[PDB]
Ligand binder design. Structure first.
Ligand SMILES: CNCc1cccc(-c2cccs2)c1
Length: 188
């Protein structure tokens, strides 16, 4: 067939019950995730092609970057709680991987301050149990699928995107194939 298990996607041998519809995982340390987000814009183009009533969830992971990697998962929780993902994603990726100016939790905080989040608001969120709950949700979701590589995208806790079965001679074609596969899987 045109889409086949083991090709554009794989099937989870143990399907995850109650999982978000479209679940993306990434790390601000992850060089391929930088490409996916800053160059290819995977999330946006997927989000874009999604059917109506299909929600998209994106979570950070801990297993890259040690202590700072864990700080970044908490900061992504702050980003989600405040609703400022579209303001901090670019400067977080560039601070970690382009300028390499992000070396501490304080450097992370600087990115939010510069993006216009007030110091008091960041700190209250950072220290909040709402954010601790959001950290826990990110860890649980990754745990549910034995997650050990990023970038990754899962559909309905059953299917895992497989970009390795896609041509990358043209970036735009790769992206739309990826997006159309997510759409196909969400309709499945
Ligand atoms: C794990 N994902 C890696 C991957 C797979 C397919 C294509 C790419 C890229 C194409 C252009 C920049 S990056 C990266």
């Amino acid at each position: 067939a045109q889409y086949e298990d083991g090709k554009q996607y794989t099937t989870l041998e143990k399907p995850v019950a109650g999982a978000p519809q479209v679940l993306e995982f990434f790390s601000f340390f992850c060089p391929h995730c930088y490409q996916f987000e800053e160059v290819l814009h995977i999330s946006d183009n997927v989000k874009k092609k999604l059917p109506e009533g299909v929600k998209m969830t994106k979570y950070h992971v801990n297993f890259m970057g040690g202590d700072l990697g864990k700080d970044l998962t908490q900061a992504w929780a702050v980003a989600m709680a405040l609703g400022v993902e579209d303001k901090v994603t670019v400067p977080l990726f560039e601070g970690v991987q382009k300028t390499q100016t992000i070396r501490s939790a304080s450097d992370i905080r600087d990115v939010f301050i510069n993006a216009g989040i007030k110091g008091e608001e960041y700190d209250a969120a950072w220290n909040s149990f709402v954010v601790k709950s959001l950290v826990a949700q990110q860890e649980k979701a990754a745990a549910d699928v034995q997650l050990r590589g990023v970038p990754a995208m899962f559909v309905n806790g059953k299917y895992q995107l497989n970009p390795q079965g896609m041509d990358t001679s043209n970036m735009d074609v790769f992206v739309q194939q990826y997006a159309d596969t997510v759409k196909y899987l969400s309709e499945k």
